[PDB]
Amino acid sequence: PQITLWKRPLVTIRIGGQLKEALLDTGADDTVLEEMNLPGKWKPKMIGGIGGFIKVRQYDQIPIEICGHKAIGTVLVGPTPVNIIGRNLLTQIGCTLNF
Amino acid sequence: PQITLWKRPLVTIRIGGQLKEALLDTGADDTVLEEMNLPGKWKPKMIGGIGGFIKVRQYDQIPIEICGHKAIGTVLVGPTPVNIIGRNLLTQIGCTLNF
Numbered sequence: 254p255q256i257t258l259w260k261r262p263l264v265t266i267r268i269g270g271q272l273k274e275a276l277l278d279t280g281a282d283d284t285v286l287e288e289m290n291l292p293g294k295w296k297p298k299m300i301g302g303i304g305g306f307i308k309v310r311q312y313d314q315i316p317i318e319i320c321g322h323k324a325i326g327t328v329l330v331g332p333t334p335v336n337i338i339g340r341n342l343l344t345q346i347g348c349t350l351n352f
Numbered sequence: 353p354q355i356t357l358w359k360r361p362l363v364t365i366r367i368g369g370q371l372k373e374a375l376l377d378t379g380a381d382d383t384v385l386e387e388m389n390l391p392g393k394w395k396p397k398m399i400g401g402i403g404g405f406i407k408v409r410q411y412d413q414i415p416i417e418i419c420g421h422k423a424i425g426t427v428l429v430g431p432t433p434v435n436i437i438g439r440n441l442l443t444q445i446g447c448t449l450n451f
């Protein structure tokens with residue numbers, strides 16, 4: 254599909270038994286999701302943006318479905334105000350910028 | 353052009369006769385540039401990101417040529433980690449997300 258940018262490019266994502274709305278975010282290197290208690294190993298990390306840094310937990314090889322497209326990769330979990338689908342997963346679902 | 357996302361979507365922009373690199377950011381409502389001088393009246397504004405809120409200067413009706421495509425609109429100047437072209441200008445140049 255083609256998504257115009259008049260409004261925020263929010264799409265439905267699925268991670269486990271949780272459906273969430275997330276931003277398709279070409280400015281984000283990484284995928285950052287709102288606080289959630291995922292199983293398995295993780296590592297602490299800091300990530301920086303407008304306003305400064307937040308602390309997140311890095312989980313690896315997490316399957317995530319984005320508009321019915323399968324992805325699997327690193328997901329950062331922490332107190333983000335918005336769920337963010339970054340370039341690590343945008344590539345896996347075939348997402349490009351066009352103009 | 354068609355731009356893939358294995359690398360950061362950084363492009364050359366032209367603003368006030370100066371060349372800068374800016375990130376095409378679908379996760380940005382607005383266009384935010386690092387500290388620089390722009391002509392004309394500006395208004396104080398506050399914007400929120402992942403790490404909280406920052407103060408910016410809002411300049412209206414600023415021409416920017418983005419990868420050869422002309423935009424004229426609002427530019428915020430302030431402590432963004434990287435120059436970002438946001439949706440206000442991405443829409444002007446006909447930029448969409450596709451997968």
Ligand SMILES: COc1cccc(S(=O)(=O)N(Cc2cccs2)C[C@@H](O)[C@H](Cc2ccccc2)NC(=O)c2ccc(O)c(O)c2)c1
Nearest residue numbers: 280281282283300301302303379380381382399400401402
């Ligand atoms: C390794 O670090 C990161 C990994 C993943 C995401 C981010 S990010 O969210 O801070 N951000 C990176 C930025 C690049 C330039 C400025 S911030 C991605 C942006 O697209 C970010 C998404 C976002 C986050 C929180 C709330 C809204 C949007 N955009 C902005 O912070 C932003 C852009 C324009 C605005 O006018 C504004 O108020 C906020 C950082």
